[PDB]
């Protein structure tokens, strides 16, 4: 019964065929990665990877030598509405 | 003469319905997601089921 | 956006948002809609644009 | 079950909506533009004699 006393609603922008997984995931946005999905000599290096989104801000640090599965679990969880997969599909050919 | 690159590591492509954003100091991010900066939409009409 | 995005921040009062990867209006829109929990400022993008 | 419902984000959204609704019930009680519970109540006294 007062001015500007309202209740907000945050209905979805649209639900057309443009809604889905807001996600590249790896190695496919702009340029491919250097260690992920690629054979390396030193492997995964140490450091952290900032993951901002959905209000909460995280700073999960990925140590060196960590397998892909390591990053898979670590980057998963805390961030609201986030899943994580992990695969190491590769080919080989013995010749020469 | 043996090679140098021997640690084969696959992709860590994750998934998120909402909008995320990934950044990292120096090469920490690029070695994992490359040039990837914020997110995508995936615009699912091209399912190619 | 000429070759890249706008990796900037938004200080909503006390706390500060750390968004990134802004290329179009939709990007900033979804980034605000997602972080709506933390930032005490509602976002409203009419589908007009 | 401490791990079974991954929709804890939607649950927190539900709880925040309930909290904002409670804050609204605090308001809108302006019996004379002088909202009883929230606002500014001076801990007054009614005359009877």
PDB file of C-alpha atoms in Angstrom:
ATOM      1  CA  UNK A   1       0.000   0.000   0.000  1.00  0.00           C
ATOM      2  CA  UNK A   2       3.047   2.294  -0.241  1.00  0.00           C
ATOM      3  CA  UNK A   3       4.914   3.800  -3.170  1.00  0.00           C
ATOM      4  CA  UNK A   4       7.587   1.641  -4.826  1.00  0.00           C
ATOM      5  CA  UNK A   5       6.813  -1.212  -2.434  1.00  0.00           C
ATOM      6  CA  UNK A   6       6.976  -4.035  -4.981  1.00  0.00           C
ATOM      7  CA  UNK A   7       7.968  -7.687  -5.319  1.00  0.00           C
ATOM      8  CA  UNK A   8      10.532  -8.469  -8.001  1.00  0.00           C
ATOM      9  CA  UNK A   9      10.379 -11.486 -10.308  1.00  0.00           C
ATOM     10  CA  UNK A  10      13.313 -12.854 -12.319  1.00  0.00           C
ATOM     11  CA  UNK A  11      11.549 -14.879 -15.004  1.00  0.00           C
ATOM     12  CA  UNK A  12      13.885 -16.385 -17.587  1.00  0.00           C
ATOM     13  CA  UNK A  13      14.909 -14.178 -20.508  1.00  0.00           C
ATOM     14  CA  UNK A  14      13.621 -16.786 -22.983  1.00  0.00           C
ATOM     15  CA  UNK A  15      13.382 -20.558 -23.352  1.00  0.00           C
ATOM     16  CA  UNK A  16      13.976 -20.891 -27.094  1.00  0.00           C
ATOM     17  CA  UNK A  17      16.448 -23.283 -28.726  1.00  0.00           C
ATOM     18  CA  UNK A  18      19.199 -20.940 -27.511  1.00  0.00           C
ATOM     19  CA  UNK A  19      19.059 -22.141 -23.877  1.00  0.00           C
ATOM     20  CA  UNK A  20      21.303 -24.957 -22.715  1.00  0.00           C
ATOM     21  CA  UNK A  21      24.872 -25.486 -21.484  1.00  0.00           C
ATOM     22  CA  UNK A  22      26.570 -22.095 -21.136  1.00  0.00           C
ATOM     23  CA  UNK A  23      29.874 -23.909 -21.389  1.00  0.00           C
ATOM     24  CA  UNK A  24      32.868 -24.408 -23.674  1.00  0.00           C
ATOM     25  CA  UNK A  25      34.595 -26.588 -21.091  1.00  0.00           C
ATOM     26  CA  UNK A  26      38.169 -26.680 -22.421  1.00  0.00           C
ATOM     27  CA  UNK A  27      40.549 -26.298 -25.365  1.00  0.00           C
ATOM     28  CA  UNK A  28      37.850 -25.061 -27.737  1.00  0.00           C
ATOM     29  CA  UNK A  29      37.380 -21.356 -27.056  1.00  0.00           C
ATOM     30  CA  UNK A  30      39.765 -19.220 -29.104  1.00  0.00           C
ATOM     31  CA  UNK A  31      42.863 -21.425 -28.926  1.00  0.00           C
ATOM     32  CA  UNK A  32      43.536 -24.959 -27.736  1.00  0.00           C
ATOM     33  CA  UNK A  33      45.180 -25.512 -24.364  1.00  0.00           C
ATOM     34  CA  UNK A  34      48.849 -26.415 -23.895  1.00  0.00           C
ATOM     35  CA  UNK A  35      48.597 -29.291 -21.385  1.00  0.00           C
ATOM     36  CA  UNK A  36      44.904 -30.207 -21.419  1.00  0.00           C
ATOM     37  CA  UNK A  37      44.151 -32.617 -24.247  1.00  0.00           C
ATOM     38  CA  UNK A  38      47.816 -32.527 -25.261  1.00  0.00           C
ATOM     39  CA  UNK A  39      50.958 -34.541 -24.533  1.00  0.00           C
ATOM     40  CA  UNK A  40      53.466 -32.609 -22.423  1.00  0.00           C
ATOM     41  CA  UNK A  41      56.921 -33.141 -20.934  1.00  0.00           C
ATOM     42  CA  UNK A  42      56.500 -31.330 -17.604  1.00  0.00           C
ATOM     43  CA  UNK A  43      52.739 -31.895 -17.454  1.00  0.00           C
ATOM     44  CA  UNK A  44      50.179 -29.916 -15.499  1.00  0.00           C
ATOM     45  CA  UNK A  45      51.903 -27.017 -13.733  1.00  0.00           C
ATOM     46  CA  UNK A  46      51.176 -25.456 -10.360  1.00  0.00           C
ATOM     47  CA  UNK A  47      49.087 -22.343  -9.772  1.00  0.00           C
ATOM     48  CA  UNK A  48      45.429 -21.439  -9.386  1.00  0.00           C
ATOM     49  CA  UNK A  49      42.434 -21.077 -11.693  1.00  0.00           C
ATOM     50  CA  UNK A  50      39.850 -18.411 -10.898  1.00  0.00           C
ATOM     51  CA  UNK A  51      36.244 -19.531 -11.440  1.00  0.00           C
ATOM     52  CA  UNK A  52      33.778 -16.683 -10.920  1.00  0.00           C
ATOM     53  CA  UNK A  53      30.054 -17.176 -11.404  1.00  0.00           C
ATOM     54  CA  UNK A  54      26.715 -17.351  -9.618  1.00  0.00           C
ATOM     55  CA  UNK A  55      27.562 -14.898  -6.856  1.00  0.00           C
ATOM     56  CA  UNK A  56      30.151 -17.080  -5.150  1.00  0.00           C
ATOM     57  CA  UNK A  57      33.785 -16.607  -6.192  1.00  0.00           C
ATOM     58  CA  UNK A  58      36.299 -19.449  -5.948  1.00  0.00           C
ATOM     59  CA  UNK A  59      40.069 -19.689  -6.296  1.00  0.00           C
ATOM     60  CA  UNK A  60      40.793 -23.453  -6.540  1.00  0.00           C
ATOM     61  CA  UNK A  61      44.530 -23.996  -6.958  1.00  0.00           C
ATOM     62  CA  UNK A  62      45.770 -26.822  -9.188  1.00  0.00           C
ATOM     63  CA  UNK A  63      49.137 -28.217  -8.125  1.00  0.00           C
ATOM     64  CA  UNK A  64      51.694 -29.524 -10.600  1.00  0.00           C
ATOM     65  CA  UNK A  65      51.592 -33.117 -11.795  1.00  0.00           C
ATOM     66  CA  UNK A  66      47.880 -33.373 -10.984  1.00  0.00           C
ATOM     67  CA  UNK A  67      45.973 -35.695 -13.317  1.00  0.00           C
ATOM     68  CA  UNK A  68      42.988 -34.474 -15.320  1.00  0.00           C
ATOM     69  CA  UNK A  69      40.707 -36.186 -12.795  1.00  0.00           C
ATOM     70  CA  UNK A  70      42.252 -34.039 -10.059  1.00  0.00           C
ATOM     71  CA  UNK A  71      41.123 -30.812 -11.770  1.00  0.00           C
ATOM     72  CA  UNK A  72      37.849 -32.614 -12.499  1.00  0.00           C
ATOM     73  CA  UNK A  73      36.930 -33.041  -8.830  1.00  0.00           C
ATOM     74  CA  UNK A  74      38.568 -29.836  -7.548  1.00  0.00           C
ATOM     75  CA  UNK A  75      36.864 -27.452  -9.981  1.00  0.00           C
ATOM     76  CA  UNK A  76      33.590 -29.309  -9.317  1.00  0.00           C
ATOM     77  CA  UNK A  77      31.417 -28.948  -6.221  1.00  0.00           C
ATOM     78  CA  UNK A  78      31.601 -25.520  -4.559  1.00  0.00           C
ATOM     79  CA  UNK A  79      30.525 -23.484  -7.604  1.00  0.00           C
ATOM     80  CA  UNK A  80      26.700 -23.542  -7.680  1.00  0.00           C
ATOM     81  CA  UNK A  81      25.160 -25.429 -10.611  1.00  0.00           C
ATOM     82  CA  UNK A  82      28.364 -26.872 -12.038  1.00  0.00           C
ATOM     83  CA  UNK A  83      29.308 -30.390 -13.141  1.00  0.00           C
ATOM     84  CA  UNK A  84      32.610 -31.782 -14.392  1.00  0.00           C
ATOM     85  CA  UNK A  85      33.742 -34.573 -16.709  1.00  0.00           C
ATOM     86  CA  UNK A  86      37.177 -36.041 -17.505  1.00  0.00           C
ATOM     87  CA  UNK A  87      38.494 -38.107 -20.423  1.00  0.00           C
ATOM     88  CA  UNK A  88      41.928 -38.901 -21.881  1.00  0.00           C
ATOM     89  CA  UNK A  89      40.991 -40.363 -25.273  1.00  0.00           C
ATOM     90  CA  UNK A  90      44.104 -40.540 -27.453  1.00  0.00           C
ATOM     91  CA  UNK A  91      45.359 -42.417 -30.504  1.00  0.00           C
ATOM     92  CA  UNK A  92      48.655 -44.149 -31.251  1.00  0.00           C
ATOM     93  CA  UNK A  93      50.449 -45.777 -34.177  1.00  0.00           C
ATOM     94  CA  UNK A  94      53.628 -47.865 -33.977  1.00  0.00           C
ATOM     95  CA  UNK A  95      55.721 -47.422 -37.133  1.00  0.00           C
ATOM     96  CA  UNK A  96      59.332 -47.156 -38.235  1.00  0.00           C
TER      97      UNK A  96
ATOM     98  CA  UNK B   1      67.134 -40.123 -29.006  1.00  0.00           C
ATOM     99  CA  UNK B   2      63.985 -40.376 -26.895  1.00  0.00           C
ATOM    100  CA  UNK B   3      61.346 -37.649 -27.029  1.00  0.00           C
ATOM    101  CA  UNK B   4      60.505 -35.173 -24.261  1.00  0.00           C
ATOM    102  CA  UNK B   5      56.707 -34.888 -24.126  1.00  0.00           C
ATOM    103  CA  UNK B   6      55.534 -38.016 -22.297  1.00  0.00           C
ATOM    104  CA  UNK B   7      52.750 -36.899 -19.913  1.00  0.00           C
ATOM    105  CA  UNK B   8      49.594 -37.454 -21.969  1.00  0.00           C
ATOM    106  CA  UNK B   9      46.752 -35.528 -20.321  1.00  0.00           C
ATOM    107  CA  UNK B  10      43.232 -35.328 -21.712  1.00  0.00           C
ATOM    108  CA  UNK B  11      40.596 -32.612 -21.649  1.00  0.00           C
ATOM    109  CA  UNK B  12      38.808 -31.532 -18.471  1.00  0.00           C
ATOM    110  CA  UNK B  13      35.719 -30.153 -20.199  1.00  0.00           C
ATOM    111  CA  UNK B  14      33.156 -29.526 -17.470  1.00  0.00           C
ATOM    112  CA  UNK B  15      29.552 -28.348 -17.703  1.00  0.00           C
ATOM    113  CA  UNK B  16      27.484 -25.543 -16.186  1.00  0.00           C
ATOM    114  CA  UNK B  17      23.863 -24.519 -16.861  1.00  0.00           C
ATOM    115  CA  UNK B  18      24.332 -20.958 -15.590  1.00  0.00           C
ATOM    116  CA  UNK B  19      26.985 -18.469 -16.737  1.00  0.00           C
ATOM    117  CA  UNK B  20      30.523 -18.983 -15.433  1.00  0.00           C
ATOM    118  CA  UNK B  21      33.845 -17.193 -15.963  1.00  0.00           C
ATOM    119  CA  UNK B  22      37.368 -18.649 -15.853  1.00  0.00           C
ATOM    120  CA  UNK B  23      40.555 -16.619 -15.450  1.00  0.00           C
ATOM    121  CA  UNK B  24      44.077 -17.422 -14.329  1.00  0.00           C
ATOM    122  CA  UNK B  25      47.454 -15.840 -13.642  1.00  0.00           C
ATOM    123  CA  UNK B  26      49.890 -16.318 -16.508  1.00  0.00           C
ATOM    124  CA  UNK B  27      49.769 -19.772 -18.088  1.00  0.00           C
ATOM    125  CA  UNK B  28      47.798 -21.521 -15.311  1.00  0.00           C
ATOM    126  CA  UNK B  29      44.517 -20.999 -17.172  1.00  0.00           C
ATOM    127  CA  UNK B  30      45.737 -21.353 -20.767  1.00  0.00           C
ATOM    128  CA  UNK B  31      47.311 -24.746 -20.059  1.00  0.00           C
ATOM    129  CA  UNK B  32      43.847 -25.986 -19.053  1.00  0.00           C
ATOM    130  CA  UNK B  33      41.235 -24.015 -21.033  1.00  0.00           C
ATOM    131  CA  UNK B  34      43.344 -21.953 -23.411  1.00  0.00           C
ATOM    132  CA  UNK B  35      41.943 -18.658 -24.644  1.00  0.00           C
ATOM    133  CA  UNK B  36      38.589 -19.440 -22.971  1.00  0.00           C
ATOM    134  CA  UNK B  37      37.542 -16.368 -20.993  1.00  0.00           C
ATOM    135  CA  UNK B  38      33.971 -16.455 -19.709  1.00  0.00           C
ATOM    136  CA  UNK B  39      31.499 -18.976 -21.123  1.00  0.00           C
ATOM    137  CA  UNK B  40      29.468 -20.004 -24.164  1.00  0.00           C
ATOM    138  CA  UNK B  41      25.766 -20.634 -24.874  1.00  0.00           C
ATOM    139  CA  UNK B  42      26.033 -23.798 -27.019  1.00  0.00           C
ATOM    140  CA  UNK B  43      22.890 -22.571 -28.832  1.00  0.00           C
ATOM    141  CA  UNK B  44      21.369 -26.040 -28.899  1.00  0.00           C
ATOM    142  CA  UNK B  45      19.527 -26.419 -32.200  1.00  0.00           C
ATOM    143  CA  UNK B  46      22.436 -28.168 -33.994  1.00  0.00           C
ATOM    144  CA  UNK B  47      22.218 -31.256 -31.742  1.00  0.00           C
ATOM    145  CA  UNK B  48      23.310 -33.476 -34.663  1.00  0.00           C
ATOM    146  CA  UNK B  49      21.864 -36.354 -32.651  1.00  0.00           C
TER     147      UNK B  49
ATOM    148  CA  UNK C   1      34.603  -6.043 -29.187  1.00  0.00           C
ATOM    149  CA  UNK C   2      37.770  -5.936 -31.283  1.00  0.00           C
ATOM    150  CA  UNK C   3      39.739  -9.109 -30.578  1.00  0.00           C
ATOM    151  CA  UNK C   4      38.846  -9.946 -26.986  1.00  0.00           C
ATOM    152  CA  UNK C   5      36.417  -9.065 -24.225  1.00  0.00           C
ATOM    153  CA  UNK C   6      35.966  -6.555 -21.398  1.00  0.00           C
ATOM    154  CA  UNK C   7      37.338  -8.224 -18.267  1.00  0.00           C
ATOM    155  CA  UNK C   8      36.252  -5.573 -15.775  1.00  0.00           C
ATOM    156  CA  UNK C   9      34.710  -5.484 -12.295  1.00  0.00           C
ATOM    157  CA  UNK C  10      31.600  -3.961 -10.729  1.00  0.00           C
ATOM    158  CA  UNK C  11      31.647  -2.549  -7.191  1.00  0.00           C
ATOM    159  CA  UNK C  12      28.098  -2.814  -5.837  1.00  0.00           C
ATOM    160  CA  UNK C  13      28.466  -0.916  -2.580  1.00  0.00           C
ATOM    161  CA  UNK C  14      30.529  -2.827  -0.030  1.00  0.00           C
ATOM    162  CA  UNK C  15      31.230  -6.028  -1.956  1.00  0.00           C
ATOM    163  CA  UNK C  16      32.732  -6.094  -5.448  1.00  0.00           C
ATOM    164  CA  UNK C  17      31.747  -8.287  -8.397  1.00  0.00           C
ATOM    165  CA  UNK C  18      34.519  -9.919 -10.437  1.00  0.00           C
ATOM    166  CA  UNK C  19      32.783 -10.609 -13.762  1.00  0.00           C
ATOM    167  CA  UNK C  20      34.689 -11.126 -17.022  1.00  0.00           C
ATOM    168  CA  UNK C  21      34.235 -11.970 -20.704  1.00  0.00           C
ATOM    169  CA  UNK C  22      31.859  -9.232 -21.858  1.00  0.00           C
ATOM    170  CA  UNK C  23      31.340  -9.169 -25.626  1.00  0.00           C
ATOM    171  CA  UNK C  24      27.614  -8.464 -26.013  1.00  0.00           C
ATOM    172  CA  UNK C  25      24.764  -7.115 -23.899  1.00  0.00           C
ATOM    173  CA  UNK C  26      23.530 -10.673 -23.321  1.00  0.00           C
ATOM    174  CA  UNK C  27      26.840 -11.603 -21.679  1.00  0.00           C
ATOM    175  CA  UNK C  28      26.676  -8.814 -19.100  1.00  0.00           C
ATOM    176  CA  UNK C  29      22.968  -9.543 -18.637  1.00  0.00           C
ATOM    177  CA  UNK C  30      23.492 -13.207 -17.759  1.00  0.00           C
ATOM    178  CA  UNK C  31      26.504 -12.349 -15.597  1.00  0.00           C
ATOM    179  CA  UNK C  32      24.354  -9.971 -13.539  1.00  0.00           C
ATOM    180  CA  UNK C  33      21.453 -12.434 -13.414  1.00  0.00           C
ATOM    181  CA  UNK C  34      23.779 -15.154 -12.103  1.00  0.00           C
ATOM    182  CA  UNK C  35      25.518 -13.120  -9.399  1.00  0.00           C
ATOM    183  CA  UNK C  36      22.172 -11.634  -8.270  1.00  0.00           C
ATOM    184  CA  UNK C  37      22.593 -13.487  -4.963  1.00  0.00           C
ATOM    185  CA  UNK C  38      25.742 -11.613  -3.911  1.00  0.00           C
ATOM    186  CA  UNK C  39      25.112  -8.233  -5.578  1.00  0.00           C
ATOM    187  CA  UNK C  40      22.130  -6.516  -3.991  1.00  0.00           C
ATOM    188  CA  UNK C  41      20.981  -4.956  -7.263  1.00  0.00           C
ATOM    189  CA  UNK C  42      18.384  -6.618  -9.481  1.00  0.00           C
ATOM    190  CA  UNK C  43      18.970  -6.909 -13.225  1.00  0.00           C
ATOM    191  CA  UNK C  44      16.264  -6.618 -15.861  1.00  0.00           C
ATOM    192  CA  UNK C  45      17.037  -6.997 -19.575  1.00  0.00           C
ATOM    193  CA  UNK C  46      13.912  -6.724 -21.697  1.00  0.00           C
ATOM    194  CA  UNK C  47      14.150  -9.142 -24.617  1.00  0.00           C
ATOM    195  CA  UNK C  48      14.138  -6.103 -26.921  1.00  0.00           C
ATOM    196  CA  UNK C  49      17.866  -5.757 -26.286  1.00  0.00           C
TER     197      UNK C  49
ATOM    198  CA  UNK D   1      21.296 -36.428   3.409  1.00  0.00           C
ATOM    199  CA  UNK D   2      24.087 -33.809   3.327  1.00  0.00           C
ATOM    200  CA  UNK D   3      24.941 -34.768  -0.254  1.00  0.00           C
ATOM    201  CA  UNK D   4      21.842 -35.999  -2.101  1.00  0.00           C
ATOM    202  CA  UNK D   5      20.135 -32.823  -3.374  1.00  0.00           C
ATOM    203  CA  UNK D   6      22.504 -30.986  -5.713  1.00  0.00           C
ATOM    204  CA  UNK D   7      19.773 -28.314  -5.977  1.00  0.00           C
ATOM    205  CA  UNK D   8      21.060 -26.661  -2.796  1.00  0.00           C
ATOM    206  CA  UNK D   9      21.479 -23.508  -4.902  1.00  0.00           C
ATOM    207  CA  UNK D  10      17.753 -23.437  -5.666  1.00  0.00           C
ATOM    208  CA  UNK D  11      17.138 -24.245  -1.999  1.00  0.00           C
ATOM    209  CA  UNK D  12      19.214 -21.227  -0.955  1.00  0.00           C
ATOM    210  CA  UNK D  13      17.262 -19.139  -3.468  1.00  0.00           C
ATOM    211  CA  UNK D  14      14.047 -20.377  -1.835  1.00  0.00           C
ATOM    212  CA  UNK D  15      15.380 -19.452   1.609  1.00  0.00           C
ATOM    213  CA  UNK D  16      16.457 -15.995   0.404  1.00  0.00           C
ATOM    214  CA  UNK D  17      13.009 -15.440  -1.100  1.00  0.00           C
ATOM    215  CA  UNK D  18      11.468 -16.411   2.244  1.00  0.00           C
ATOM    216  CA  UNK D  19      13.842 -13.996   3.993  1.00  0.00           C
ATOM    217  CA  UNK D  20      12.918 -11.108   1.690  1.00  0.00           C
ATOM    218  CA  UNK D  21       9.239 -11.956   2.173  1.00  0.00           C
ATOM    219  CA  UNK D  22       9.740 -11.813   5.944  1.00  0.00           C
ATOM    220  CA  UNK D  23      11.459  -8.437   5.572  1.00  0.00           C
ATOM    221  CA  UNK D  24       8.429  -7.322   3.552  1.00  0.00           C
ATOM    222  CA  UNK D  25       6.028  -8.533   6.264  1.00  0.00           C
ATOM    223  CA  UNK D  26       8.077  -6.339   8.586  1.00  0.00           C
ATOM    224  CA  UNK D  27       7.095  -3.489   6.255  1.00  0.00           C
ATOM    225  CA  UNK D  28       3.598  -2.897   4.776  1.00  0.00           C
ATOM    226  CA  UNK D  29       2.266  -2.752   8.361  1.00  0.00           C
ATOM    227  CA  UNK D  30       1.917   1.033   8.092  1.00  0.00           C
ATOM    228  CA  UNK D  31      -1.163   1.552  10.236  1.00  0.00           C
ATOM    229  CA  UNK D  32      -1.013   5.274   9.515  1.00  0.00           C
ATOM    230  CA  UNK D  33       2.255   5.406   7.560  1.00  0.00           C
ATOM    231  CA  UNK D  34       4.004   4.443  10.795  1.00  0.00           C
ATOM    232  CA  UNK D  35       4.917   0.774  10.184  1.00  0.00           C
ATOM    233  CA  UNK D  36       4.742  -1.097  13.477  1.00  0.00           C
ATOM    234  CA  UNK D  37       7.449  -3.770  13.437  1.00  0.00           C
ATOM    235  CA  UNK D  38      10.095  -2.275  11.139  1.00  0.00           C
ATOM    236  CA  UNK D  39      10.614   1.345  10.191  1.00  0.00           C
ATOM    237  CA  UNK D  40      10.879   3.587  13.254  1.00  0.00           C
ATOM    238  CA  UNK D  41       8.888   2.609  16.346  1.00  0.00           C
ATOM    239  CA  UNK D  42       9.674   4.777  19.356  1.00  0.00           C
ATOM    240  CA  UNK D  43       8.442   2.252  21.959  1.00  0.00           C
ATOM    241  CA  UNK D  44       5.457   4.435  22.757  1.00  0.00           C
ATOM    242  CA  UNK D  45       2.741   4.406  25.435  1.00  0.00           C
ATOM    243  CA  UNK D  46      -1.042   4.677  25.103  1.00  0.00           C
ATOM    244  CA  UNK D  47      -3.010   6.973  27.407  1.00  0.00           C
ATOM    245  CA  UNK D  48      -6.015   5.374  29.113  1.00  0.00           C
ATOM    246  CA  UNK D  49      -7.055   7.580  32.056  1.00  0.00           C
TER     247      UNK D  49
END
